[PDB]
Design a protein around this ligand. Structure first.
Ligand SMILES: Nc1ncnc2c1ncn2[C@@H]1O[C@H](COP(=O)(O)CP(=O)(O)OP(=O)(O)O)[C@@H](O)[C@H]1O
Length: 159
């Protein structure tokens, strides 16, 4: 992704849910910190195209394995801790468009190991609200807003 005027790189985030009130939670490669899939937008790519590229490259899935249930409307931004800014044009954060997907294929279709440098080691199902308290603090405000925006849909499926 290319950094914009203000130092924010455009990215997409992905919340994948099932019908049990759960979302797909993934362990950052070589870490004990966990997060949702997120990926950059290449020039020319739409947000939806970037999302399906992230879905393929780091989750191993096709359009055909999911259905899009919702999308956030505007960019949601987080700023990197000043200690984590890699030095230009220097990136100070991300602006993100988020997607809620329902997994309709089997769990075994998920493959997080196809890249030579995976985003993730692997994943597990967690309860819907578990991500807000478990994600790194500088993303917590973005996560709280996304999970609130998506909450009605996931809970209705879970009934
Ligand atoms: N949960 C976490 N705990 C500690 N550090 C984290 C973290 N999540 C992210 N970071 C740090 O924040 C930096 C920026 O992370 P992100 O904004 O998630 C993009 P990235 O993971 O570096 O991949 P990218 O190549 O797509 O940019 C990373 O170098 C990472 O070390």
């Amino acid at each position: 992704s290319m950094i914009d005027d203000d130092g924010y790189r455009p990215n997409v985030g992905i919340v994948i849910c099932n019908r049990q009130g759960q979302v797909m939670w993934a362990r950052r490669f070589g870490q004990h910190s966990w997060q949702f899939p997120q990926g950059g937008i290449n020039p020319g790519e739409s947000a939806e195209q970037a999302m399906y590229r992230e879905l393929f490259e780091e989750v191993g899935l096709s359009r055909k394995d999911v259905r899009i249930l919702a999308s956030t409307r505007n960019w949601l931004r987080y700023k990197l801790p000043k200690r984590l800014v890699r030095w230009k044009p220097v990136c100070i954060g991300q602006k993100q468009k988020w997607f809620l997907l329902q997994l309709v294929s089997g769990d075994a279709e998920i493959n997080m190991q196809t890249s030579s440098t995976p985003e993730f080691d692997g994943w597990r199902w967690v309860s819907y609200w578990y991500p807000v308290r478990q994600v790194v603090s500088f993303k917590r405000d973005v996560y709280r807003r996304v999970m609130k925006e998506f909450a009605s849909v996931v809970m209705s499926l879970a009934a």
